[PDB]
Amino acid sequence: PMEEEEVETFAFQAEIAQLMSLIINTFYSNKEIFLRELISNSSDALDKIRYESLTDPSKLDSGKELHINLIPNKQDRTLTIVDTGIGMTKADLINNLGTIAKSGTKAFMEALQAGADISMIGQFGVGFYSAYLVAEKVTVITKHNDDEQYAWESSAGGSFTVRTDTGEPMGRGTKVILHLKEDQTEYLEERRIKEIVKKHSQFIGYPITLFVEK
Ligand SMILES: Nc1ncnc2c1ncn2[C@@H]1O[C@@H]2COP(=O)(O)O[C@H]2[C@H]1O
């Protein structure tokens, strides 16, 4: 019997959409920073669950260990960043990843046309969009204590979708799946992945594990 599923389609805030287009349709050197950005956010989410749980231990019922996994997959050209942080609720997703204006956006987009490195992206608080340096399509699966597991997704172009996730239950945390663009498969190489972790994500304060298929 046929399953039904609710999809909600949202427009990105105008300047996000401008920023997203700028990321996708300009050449940038040094695109490797995208991974530093996503580890940072897991690091943030990880600090959050750690602190929130000192207030309330039961918040770790969804899992005690707080870590980041990196999962490259050469068959489907996805690199997946997994954390056991606080996760995002449906409203966390909609507000935080595209809906609500960010105050840095205009300044950063002026900083790029003046010729700053896309490295600067973190300090303007629009670092998540660096995913678009290397990915044609991003999926975010997220599970917060206070909420059901949701999937956000966007091929840029002005829009993203949210829906309840029907895939594997995660427990608590965030899964960012980068569907990588063809010319960017280097971020599937465990050599390359190790290189950039050690270069840029040195003193994130949670263990990081790379899983290599073979
Ligand atoms: N891995 C993650 N876990 C929890 N929340 C996240 C994650 N990635 C992004 N977010 C939310 O998306 C937001 C984007 O801007 P900020 O990094 O300031 O804050 C980020 C978080 O609020």
Side-chain angles (χ1 to χ4, degrees), residues 9-14 16-22 24-25 129 132 135-138 152-160:
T9 303
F10 289 89
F12 286 103
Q13 199 272 357
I16 303 321
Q18 278 179 62
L19 176 64
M20 294 191 62
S21 183
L22 210 84
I24 283 265
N25 298 268
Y129 298 102
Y132 292 94
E136 68 199 355
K137 170 160 85 161
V138 169
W152 181 105
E153 188 180 70
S154 175
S155 299
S159 290
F160 61 88

Coordinates of all heavy atoms in Angstrom, one line a residue, residues 9-14 16-22 24-25 129 132 135-138 152-160:
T9 N 8.3 23.1 0.5 CA 9.3 23.8 -0.4 C 9.4 25.3 0.0 O 8.4 26.0 0.0 CB 8.9 23.8 -1.8 OG1 8.7 22.4 -2.2 CG2 9.8 24.4 -2.8
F10 N 10.6 25.8 0.3 CA 10.8 27.2 0.8 C 11.7 27.9 -0.1 O 12.6 27.4 -0.7 CB 11.5 27.1 2.2 CG 10.6 26.6 3.3 CD1 10.5 25.3 3.6 CD2 9.8 27.5 4.0 CE1 9.7 24.8 4.6 CE2 9.0 27.1 5.0 CZ 8.9 25.7 5.3
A11 N 11.5 29.3 -0.2 CA 12.4 30.1 -0.9 C 13.5 30.6 0.0 O 13.3 30.8 1.2 CB 11.7 31.3 -1.5
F12 N 14.8 30.6 -0.5 CA 15.9 31.2 0.3 C 15.7 32.7 0.3 O 15.3 33.3 -0.7 CB 17.2 30.9 -0.3 CG 17.8 29.5 -0.2 CD1 17.8 28.6 -1.3 CD2 18.4 29.1 1.0 CE1 18.3 27.4 -1.1 CE2 18.9 27.8 1.1 CZ 18.9 27.0 0.1
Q13 N 15.9 33.3 1.5 CA 16.2 34.7 1.7 C 17.0 35.2 0.5 O 18.0 34.6 0.1 CB 16.9 35.0 3.0 CG 16.7 36.4 3.5 CD 17.8 37.3 2.9 OE1 18.7 36.8 2.2 NE2 17.8 38.5 3.2
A14 N 16.5 36.3 -0.1 CA 17.1 36.8 -1.3 C 18.6 36.8 -1.3 O 19.2 36.3 -2.3 CB 16.6 38.2 -1.6
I16 N 20.8 35.2 0.6 CA 21.3 33.9 0.6 C 21.4 33.4 -0.8 O 22.5 32.9 -1.2 CB 20.6 33.0 1.6 CG1 20.7 33.6 3.0 CG2 21.2 31.5 1.6 CD1 22.0 34.2 3.4
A17 N 20.3 33.5 -1.5 CA 20.2 33.0 -2.9 C 21.3 33.7 -3.8 O 21.8 33.1 -4.7 CB 18.8 33.3 -3.5
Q18 N 21.5 35.0 -3.6 CA 22.5 35.7 -4.3 C 23.9 35.1 -3.9 O 24.7 34.8 -4.7 CB 22.6 37.2 -3.9 CG 21.6 38.1 -4.7 CD 21.7 39.5 -4.2 OE1 22.7 40.1 -4.3 NE2 20.6 40.0 -3.6
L19 N 24.1 35.0 -2.6 CA 25.4 34.4 -2.1 C 25.5 32.9 -2.6 O 26.6 32.6 -3.0 CB 25.4 34.4 -0.5 CG 26.6 33.7 0.1 CD1 27.9 34.4 -0.3 CD2 26.5 33.7 1.6
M20 N 24.5 32.1 -2.6 CA 24.6 30.8 -3.2 C 25.0 30.8 -4.6 O 25.8 29.9 -5.1 CB 23.3 30.0 -3.0 CG 23.0 29.8 -1.5 SD 21.7 28.6 -1.3 CE 22.3 27.1 -2.0
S21 N 24.3 31.6 -5.4 CA 24.6 31.7 -6.9 C 26.1 32.1 -7.1 O 26.8 31.5 -7.9 CB 23.7 32.7 -7.6 OG 23.9 32.7 -8.9
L22 N 26.6 33.1 -6.3 CA 28.0 33.6 -6.4 C 29.0 32.5 -6.1 O 30.0 32.4 -6.8 CB 28.1 34.8 -5.4 CG 29.2 35.8 -5.8 CD1 28.6 36.8 -6.8 CD2 29.8 36.5 -4.6
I24 N 28.5 29.1 -6.5 CA 28.3 28.1 -7.5 C 28.9 28.6 -8.9 O 29.4 27.8 -9.6 CB 26.9 27.6 -7.6 CG1 26.5 26.6 -6.5 CG2 26.6 27.0 -9.0 CD1 26.7 25.2 -6.8
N25 N 28.8 29.9 -9.2 CA 29.1 30.2 -10.6 C 30.3 31.2 -10.6 O 30.4 31.9 -11.6 CB 27.9 30.8 -11.3 CG 26.8 29.9 -11.5 OD1 26.7 29.1 -12.5 ND2 25.9 29.9 -10.5
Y129 N 27.3 27.6 3.5 CA 27.1 27.7 2.1 C 28.3 27.3 1.2 O 28.2 27.0 0.0 CB 26.4 29.0 1.7 CG 25.0 29.1 2.3 CD1 24.8 29.8 3.5 CD2 24.0 28.3 1.8 CE1 23.6 29.9 4.1 CE2 22.7 28.3 2.5 CZ 22.5 29.1 3.6 OH 21.3 29.2 4.2
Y132 N 28.6 24.5 -1.2 CA 28.3 24.7 -2.6 C 29.5 24.8 -3.5 O 29.5 24.6 -4.7 CB 27.1 25.6 -2.9 CG 25.8 25.0 -2.4 CD1 25.3 25.3 -1.1 CD2 25.2 24.0 -3.1 CE1 24.2 24.6 -0.6 CE2 24.1 23.3 -2.6 CZ 23.6 23.6 -1.4 OH 22.5 23.0 -0.9
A135 N 29.8 20.9 -4.0 CA 28.6 20.0 -4.1 C 27.5 20.7 -5.0 O 27.3 21.9 -5.0 CB 28.1 19.7 -2.8
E136 N 26.9 19.8 -5.8 CA 25.8 20.2 -6.7 C 24.5 20.2 -5.9 O 23.5 20.9 -6.3 CB 25.8 19.3 -8.0 CG 25.3 17.9 -7.7 CD 25.7 16.9 -8.8 OE1 26.2 17.4 -9.9 OE2 25.5 15.7 -8.6
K137 N 24.5 19.5 -4.8 CA 23.3 19.2 -4.1 C 23.7 18.8 -2.7 O 24.5 17.9 -2.5 CB 22.5 18.0 -4.8 CG 21.4 17.5 -3.9 CD 20.3 16.7 -4.7 CE 20.7 15.2 -4.9 NZ 19.4 14.5 -5.2
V138 N 23.1 19.4 -1.7 CA 23.3 19.1 -0.3 C 22.0 18.5 0.3 O 21.0 19.1 0.1 CB 23.9 20.3 0.5 CG1 23.9 20.0 2.0 CG2 25.3 20.7 0.0
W152 N 16.4 18.1 5.1 CA 16.5 19.4 4.3 C 17.3 19.0 3.1 O 18.1 18.2 3.1 CB 17.3 20.4 5.2 CG 17.5 21.7 4.7 CD1 16.9 22.9 5.1 CD2 18.6 22.1 3.8 NE1 17.4 24.0 4.5 CE2 18.5 23.6 3.7 CE3 19.6 21.5 3.1 CZ2 19.3 24.3 2.9 CZ3 20.4 22.2 2.3 CH2 20.3 23.6 2.2
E153 N 17.0 19.8 2.0 CA 17.8 19.5 0.8 C 17.6 20.6 -0.3 O 16.6 21.2 -0.4 CB 17.3 18.2 0.1 CG 18.2 17.8 -1.1 CD 17.8 16.5 -1.9 OE1 16.8 16.6 -2.6 OE2 18.5 15.5 -1.7
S154 N 18.7 20.8 -1.0 CA 18.7 21.9 -1.9 C 19.8 21.7 -3.0 O 21.0 21.4 -2.7 CB 19.0 23.2 -1.2 OG 19.1 24.3 -2.1
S155 N 19.4 21.9 -4.3 CA 20.3 22.0 -5.4 C 20.5 23.4 -5.7 O 20.8 23.8 -6.9 CB 19.7 21.3 -6.6 OG 19.4 19.9 -6.3
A156 N 20.5 24.3 -4.7 CA 20.5 25.7 -4.9 C 19.5 26.1 -6.0 O 18.5 25.4 -6.2 CB 21.9 26.2 -5.2
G157 N 19.6 27.2 -6.7 CA 18.6 27.7 -7.6 C 17.4 28.4 -7.0 O 16.4 28.7 -7.7
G158 N 17.5 28.7 -5.7 CA 16.6 29.6 -5.0 C 15.7 28.9 -4.0 O 14.9 29.6 -3.3
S159 N 15.8 27.6 -3.8 CA 14.8 26.8 -3.1 C 15.4 25.7 -2.3 O 16.4 25.1 -2.8 CB 13.8 26.3 -4.1 OG 13.0 27.3 -4.7
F160 N 14.8 25.3 -1.2 CA 15.2 24.1 -0.6 C 13.9 23.4 -0.1 O 12.9 24.0 0.1 CB 16.2 24.3 0.6 CG 15.6 25.2 1.7 CD1 14.9 24.7 2.7 CD2 15.7 26.6 1.6 CE1 14.4 25.5 3.7 CE2 15.2 27.4 2.6 CZ 14.5 26.9 3.7

